[PDB]
Write a protein that binds this ligand. Sequence first.
Ligand SMILES: [Mg+2]
Ligand SMILES: [Mg+2]
Ligand SMILES: [Mg+2]
Ligand SMILES: [Mg+2]
Ligand SMILES: [Mg+2]
Ligand SMILES: [Mg+2]
Ligand SMILES: [Mg+2]
Ligand SMILES: [Mg+2]
Ligand SMILES: [Mg+2]
Ligand SMILES: [Mg+2]
Ligand SMILES: [Mg+2]
Ligand SMILES: [Mg+2]
Ligand SMILES: [Mg+2]
Ligand SMILES: [Mg+2]
Ligand SMILES: [Mg+2]
Ligand SMILES: [Mg+2]
Ligand SMILES: [Mg+2]
Ligand SMILES: [Mg+2]
Ligand SMILES: [Mg+2]
Ligand SMILES: [Mg+2]
Ligand SMILES: [Mg+2]
Ligand SMILES: [Mg+2]
Ligand SMILES: [Mg+2]
Ligand SMILES: [Mg+2]
Ligand SMILES: [Mg+2]
Ligand SMILES: [Mg+2]
Ligand SMILES: [Mg+2]
Ligand SMILES: [Mg+2]
Ligand SMILES: [Mg+2]
Ligand SMILES: [Mg+2]
Ligand SMILES: [Mg+2]
Ligand SMILES: [Mg+2]
Ligand SMILES: [Mg+2]
Ligand SMILES: [Mg+2]
Ligand SMILES: [Mg+2]
Ligand SMILES: [Mg+2]
Ligand SMILES: [Mg+2]
Ligand SMILES: [Mg+2]
Ligand SMILES: [Mg+2]
Ligand SMILES: [Mg+2]
Ligand SMILES: [Mg+2]
Ligand SMILES: [Mg+2]
Ligand SMILES: [Mg+2]
Ligand SMILES: [Mg+2]
Ligand SMILES: [Mg+2]
Ligand SMILES: [Mg+2]
Ligand SMILES: [Mg+2]
Ligand SMILES: [Mg+2]
Ligand SMILES: [Mg+2]
Ligand SMILES: [Mg+2]
Ligand SMILES: [Mg+2]
Ligand SMILES: [Mg+2]
Ligand SMILES: [Mg+2]
Ligand SMILES: [Mg+2]
Ligand SMILES: [Zn+2]
Lengths: 206, 60, 157
Amino acid sequence: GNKIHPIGFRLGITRDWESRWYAGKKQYRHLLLEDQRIRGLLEKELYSAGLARVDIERAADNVAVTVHVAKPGVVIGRGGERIRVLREELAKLTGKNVALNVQEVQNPNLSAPLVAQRVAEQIERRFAVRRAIKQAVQRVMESGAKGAKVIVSGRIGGAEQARTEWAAQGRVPLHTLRANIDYGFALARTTYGVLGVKAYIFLGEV
Amino acid sequence: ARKALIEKAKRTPKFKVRAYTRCVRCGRARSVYRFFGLCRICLRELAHKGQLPGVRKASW
Amino acid sequence: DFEEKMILIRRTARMQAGGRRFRFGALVVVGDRQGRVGLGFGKAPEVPLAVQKAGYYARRNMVEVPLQNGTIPHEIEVEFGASKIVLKPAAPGTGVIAGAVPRAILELAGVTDILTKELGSRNPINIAYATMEALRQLRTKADVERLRKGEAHAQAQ
RNA sequence: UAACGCGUUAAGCGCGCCGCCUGGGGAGUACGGCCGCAAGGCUGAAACUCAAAGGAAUUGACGGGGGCCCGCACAAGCGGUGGAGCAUGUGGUUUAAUUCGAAGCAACGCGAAGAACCUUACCAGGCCUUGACAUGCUAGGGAACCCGGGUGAAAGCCUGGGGUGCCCCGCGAGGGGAGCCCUAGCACAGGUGCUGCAUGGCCGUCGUCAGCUCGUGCCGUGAGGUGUUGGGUUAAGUCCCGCAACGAGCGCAACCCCCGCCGUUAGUUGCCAGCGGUUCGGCCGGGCACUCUAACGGGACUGCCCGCGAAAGCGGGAGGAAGGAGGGGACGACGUCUGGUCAGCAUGGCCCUUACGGCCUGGGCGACACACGUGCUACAAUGCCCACUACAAAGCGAUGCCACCCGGCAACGGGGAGCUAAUCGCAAAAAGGUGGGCCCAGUUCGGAUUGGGGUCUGCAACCCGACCCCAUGAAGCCGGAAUCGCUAGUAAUCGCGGAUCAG
Ligand SMILES: [Mg+2]
Ligand SMILES: [Mg+2]
Ligand SMILES: [Mg+2]
Ligand SMILES: [Mg+2]
Ligand SMILES: [Mg+2]
Ligand SMILES: [Mg+2]
Ligand SMILES: [Mg+2]
Ligand SMILES: [Mg+2]
Ligand SMILES: [Mg+2]
Ligand SMILES: [Mg+2]
Ligand SMILES: [Mg+2]
Ligand SMILES: [Mg+2]
Ligand SMILES: [Mg+2]
Ligand SMILES: [Mg+2]
Ligand SMILES: [Mg+2]
Ligand SMILES: [Mg+2]
Ligand SMILES: [Mg+2]
Ligand SMILES: [Mg+2]
Ligand SMILES: [Mg+2]
Ligand SMILES: [Mg+2]
Ligand SMILES: [Mg+2]
Ligand SMILES: [Mg+2]
Ligand SMILES: [Mg+2]
Ligand SMILES: [Mg+2]
Ligand SMILES: [Mg+2]
Ligand SMILES: [Mg+2]
Ligand SMILES: [Mg+2]
Ligand SMILES: [Mg+2]
Ligand SMILES: [Mg+2]
Ligand SMILES: [Mg+2]
Ligand SMILES: [Mg+2]
Ligand SMILES: [Mg+2]
Ligand SMILES: [Mg+2]
Ligand SMILES: [Mg+2]
Ligand SMILES: [Mg+2]
Ligand SMILES: [Mg+2]
Ligand SMILES: [Mg+2]
Ligand SMILES: [Mg+2]
Ligand SMILES: [Mg+2]
Ligand SMILES: [Mg+2]
Ligand SMILES: [Mg+2]
Ligand SMILES: [Mg+2]
Ligand SMILES: [Mg+2]
Ligand SMILES: [Mg+2]
Ligand SMILES: [Mg+2]
Ligand SMILES: [Mg+2]
Ligand SMILES: [Mg+2]
Ligand SMILES: [Mg+2]
Ligand SMILES: [Mg+2]
Ligand SMILES: [Mg+2]
Ligand SMILES: [Mg+2]
Ligand SMILES: [Mg+2]
Ligand SMILES: [Mg+2]
Ligand SMILES: [Mg+2]
Ligand SMILES: [Zn+2]
């Protein structure tokens, strides 16, 4: 029972919300649940493309879902087909005019949610957990970053004794508010059980 | 949040008064906020993720 | 640009309220199989890191063994603490007839034939050091002749 | 030299000679021999049994060891708990069931920010079996869907009628097909069943305590040390001086929010200072001065003066709204607790599948010889009651808040205006002020308990709602041993709002 969610802390100061709209008490309840049904689906259907953020901006009967993705082709699809299928299935579950665009996360080495994931996969694929981490943190600092940190926790290896591995380089100042710090969390699901990967990436003093 | 009771939750019941809210997420019966249709656990979680719009953390 | 070897790796414990806390130690040899060998003992909190360290240290602590045809110029015996090594040079096709540690050190030195016994404490680390110190000490009817004549050398040579 | 240490008083370098050691326990025991007045001594085993016994040094922990420092920790206070009655939680016991977890601080008004049915996981009874929910599959019957009867506590069970859409082939009768439905059968779904000692996440905690560590260098055979220690300073591993150390990371601080002063921009639904008109209401003109509202900014740095100090900094003063972190917030280091939670969610493994799944109606979670925890209301005169009269903030509300009129002792009901709200409303703020009453009394203190008559919500207030009015008017006269909180706008005291919510 320790540290604060590094985002919700910085939220509004050095970090933005993933849903940006206004709604009165009357409407809010459902436009919320509507967002969560969207982010429910695109999260399942796009794990293959490595997806960082799902931005949901809103007007009136209008939804601008910006999907932030490593491999932007996989989202698009050959011919331009796959994206059309989504947009229809979206505007089905939404019943509104869904405006799904796609944005190329140009560097997955500085996207915490992705670094997290890449590790979790690696862990699921039965890779060495310690190495998996040092080597991830590695890749993060190599690409500009000013600080980074990854924490795998759970039944590491086979392990009856559930422990915690972690590693960091540079500064990861969780107390410093003006620090832009990306956080992401991945959950690895395994024959022996489930483990969690947190990845912190310190990006720049503002 | 047994499955049936999440469904029963939605069933428009024999009397107006067996109307009760659960969390649109976990299905939790108990600390459910009208306004979000979420419990005080889910609220907390989604709030930090940044997925409840305009929901800041307070401090005064 | 030498070969490295692992003499030994160990784990060791400190103490803090609420647990042991560990640290690793690596003993590493470094040789060029033609008369230069160095020994390094490095500790870090992670094992491969310790070895890196160890390897760095080894190259800074280097010793030129005067190899005389696969073997060492005379016999020699050297104590270090509790531990004591003896190196008796040997004839061709004898092999490094030496224990676990000294071998690694001798092999990378570039030695091929040599006799050996450890004696006293068998502790790796001190035996490691005793050997390196033994080799640090060898001389030659050459090395020696210069020491003794020396004070008018080059009248007879 | 293993180190501790030794170091011309050697434990160094050597020679001579003597004594002694050869794993721990058994054991300085047994046996034998010698000495002794005796007590007993000297000499001295093994069987057996263990896998160590040991020496020195390192980190830590602990000490009814020492030193310095801090926290409402003690002290100094103010007010309480422990007693009473009641509200809640819990132990126990009881029960058909009193679902389950929480268990020293860190469980006990805790999960529960809303248990009459629902919730609801427990119990009894009546029900369903591809199932209340997902994706399917094989075979037949069907459009989907809509309405009515029987039985029943409901669920369910049985049954009657209306209805023929869409896609392809065909002139057509019509065959095929998508979707949905029913019946049979199969994958399966469902499980708040177990394991928090298989876990993720999140949290409590030591502790907002000032610590925890790393790179390189250096010391040591080494575990490890150094730095981080010492002296001064600080809320602070905060800084200063010192030093085999020089830095760095997580922490402290800072960047963020609220309050205190002023600025610029902003004038409505807010504001009223001089002025015009007034039904005396800022009501109307008009104006944004002021109040305010709320978005950006300025302002404080030991900067100035005096005194002490190598320095850091400390004490005191001036200007200033604010002075040495101005007050409060958010923010919890490496780790500890095999801490908490499989009953939020997720999840490995084990277990059930006409039953541990699911539907319902009723009951239970509210039981009461008792015990504790947290709190409310009191025991009264620095009070109580009645009337008249002032001064808040923060929120909330168009399925709602409900102004004002009417009936009614009243709860409330009928009628009905404004308000998606700086406008309309909840809204009376209560302590306070003025007047009058009571006069030390179980009382005009206290308001339990019960009798009676109503109101509202709700399908339904027996178990088990709140509220109003009449009558009843219990304990209690300041609480034993123990024990809690708080260091300034704090404690004590007085009202107000909100979340959950038909209530
Ligand atoms: Mg931690
Ligand atoms: Mg963990
Ligand atoms: Mg479940
Ligand atoms: Mg309800
Ligand atoms: Mg030489
Ligand atoms: Mg010796
Ligand atoms: Mg030879
Ligand atoms: Mg030996
Ligand atoms: Mg041995
Ligand atoms: Mg002498
Ligand atoms: Mg001696
Ligand atoms: Mg013996
Ligand atoms: Mg023996
Ligand atoms: Mg004896
Ligand atoms: Mg004796
Ligand atoms: Mg004796
Ligand atoms: Mg005898
Ligand atoms: Mg005698
Ligand atoms: Mg004697
Ligand atoms: Mg000792
Ligand atoms: Mg002490
Ligand atoms: Mg006291
Ligand atoms: Mg007292
Ligand atoms: Mg009491
Ligand atoms: Mg219980
Ligand atoms: Mg349980
Ligand atoms: Mg309640
Ligand atoms: Mg019930
Ligand atoms: Mg029931
Ligand atoms: Mg046709
Ligand atoms: Mg036809
Ligand atoms: Mg399951
Ligand atoms: Mg645990
Ligand atoms: Mg438990
Ligand atoms: Mg060294
Ligand atoms: Mg320290
Ligand atoms: Mg502090
Ligand atoms: Mg510091
Ligand atoms: Mg006038
Ligand atoms: Mg006007
Ligand atoms: Mg400001
Ligand atoms: Mg000064
Ligand atoms: Mg801070
Ligand atoms: Mg446990
Ligand atoms: Mg209860
Ligand atoms: Mg009236
Ligand atoms: Mg009324
Ligand atoms: Mg009054
Ligand atoms: Mg009076
Ligand atoms: Mg009495
Ligand atoms: Mg009295
Ligand atoms: Mg204090
Ligand atoms: Mg209240
Ligand atoms: Mg309310
Ligand atoms: Zn929830």
